[PDB]
């Protein structure tokens, strides 16, 4: 923690992000930049973790597609997220939900507040 | 792991040139009038910083 770092980096923080905590479903409108193309693809899943402070904060979203589970990590304040929505608000008793990595369907389901 | 040759007197004393011990860092208490260690409570008048403890 340093105050000079905070003053330098305060400009690039994103004020348009909503409030979410680990354990609820989100939808990420990530941008996919090709060589000369711009497209937006959707990634939807439950957030597993959220760590760090300041501009260097990241969160992780988990999704099961075609049987194989996929985890994709994003910086919180990246300009490559067009929009981030909070779909559900799950109920959890942990800050890191790593136990979901060893659970298949119908046992990884999360309640709703 | 065992001495090849015994050590002479000159070499023994040369090694022992650094095995002395230093002089204490003391001066005289203003109230006592005799010697005491700096930053320590003098044991004669039982005072530090001009105040008894």
């Amino acid at each position: 923690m340093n105050k000079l770092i905070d003053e330098i980096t305060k400009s690039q923080l994103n004020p348009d992000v909503p409030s979410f905590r680990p354990g609820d479903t989100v939808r990420v409108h990530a941008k996919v930049v090709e060589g000369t193309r711009e497209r937006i693809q959707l990634f939807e899943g439950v957030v597993i973790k959220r760590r760090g402070a300041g501009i260097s904060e990241t969160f992780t979203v988990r999704k099961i597609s075609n049987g194989v589970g996929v985890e994709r990590t994003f910086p919180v304040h990246t300009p490559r997220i067009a929009k981030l929505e909070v779909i559900r608000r799950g109920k959890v008793r942990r800050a890191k939900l790593y136990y979901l990595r060893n659970l298949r369907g119908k046992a990884a389901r999360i309640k709703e507040i | 792991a065992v001495p090849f040759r015994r050590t002479s007197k000159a070499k023994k004393r040369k090694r022992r040139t650094h095995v002395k011990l230093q002089l204490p860092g003391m001066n005289e208490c203003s109230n006592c009038g005799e010697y005491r260690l700096s930053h320590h409570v003098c044991p004669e008048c039982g005072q530090y910083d001009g105040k008894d403890v």
Partner: protein, 206 residues
Amino acid sequence: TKGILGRKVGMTQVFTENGELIPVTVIEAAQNVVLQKKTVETDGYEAVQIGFEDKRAKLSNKPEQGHVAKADTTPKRFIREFRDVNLDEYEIGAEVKVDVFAEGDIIDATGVSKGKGFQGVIKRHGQSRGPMAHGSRYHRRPGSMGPVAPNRVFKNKLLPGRMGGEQITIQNLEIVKVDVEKNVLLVKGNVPGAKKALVQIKTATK
């Protein structure tokens, strides 16, 4: 070819215009002034002497107060020299601001490494261990010291000692952002030293 002295503050990251994310290190370089100018006909070489950070009237003795009073300004804390620099600039007593660098320049960072104490040979020189099982009794030892013939052991036989604390420079290091009014300087990468270490920034030799 221009240079300043600086104080390493920390390390963070910034987003570029293209959206990519890069790590940067923050260096603040306030209060540094030009003190002396060495010429070929007086000293035998050309250099500029820069004093970086000022300190109290106490902690500074009479000789160095006289040296700084040969110019203006109060006594400083760090003083270094820069060679291979133009002397037509740098009027005596004039301050040097971070604006001497522009975004996209290439610099060389010099400093003193972090200190590690008495360190072994697996860590200091990156050697390899022996087996940890199969009845072995040889884990983290230096090795053999050479042939029987010389009746001695050669030089540059690497052995345990004091590891860190040496001077290190890294080259071709890019500069990202310059902010004049905060007297800071953002450099992409990392530079040798702990926090609050003196860092010497100069234009890349190559």
